[PDB]
Amino acid sequence: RADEVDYTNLPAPKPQKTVWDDNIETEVLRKYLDGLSQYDMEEAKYGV
């Protein structure tokens, strides 16, 4: 009868960086879209 499991351990959620279609609208908005992706990843790690 050894250790079974650490119930106080949660696999941290895996953030996935949103990818935008490569169009002219993306190039014009490259910085803005990148900021949204960074915000989404931050909201994923922290939770909200």
Next chain:
Amino acid sequence: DIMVPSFVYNKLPVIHFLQEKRAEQKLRRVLDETYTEWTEELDQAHVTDAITRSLNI
């Protein structure tokens, strides 16, 4: 009638050459002061980002 005219005649070439050089110097200075000005304007990406913040997205 004789002396001063002769010395003025002797003077003419050097003065002409110096004045030509002076005019060329003025033109060169005029050209050298020309620079193409490039102005920087606020990137519209920030404006779009602010618009999103107003949208509360």
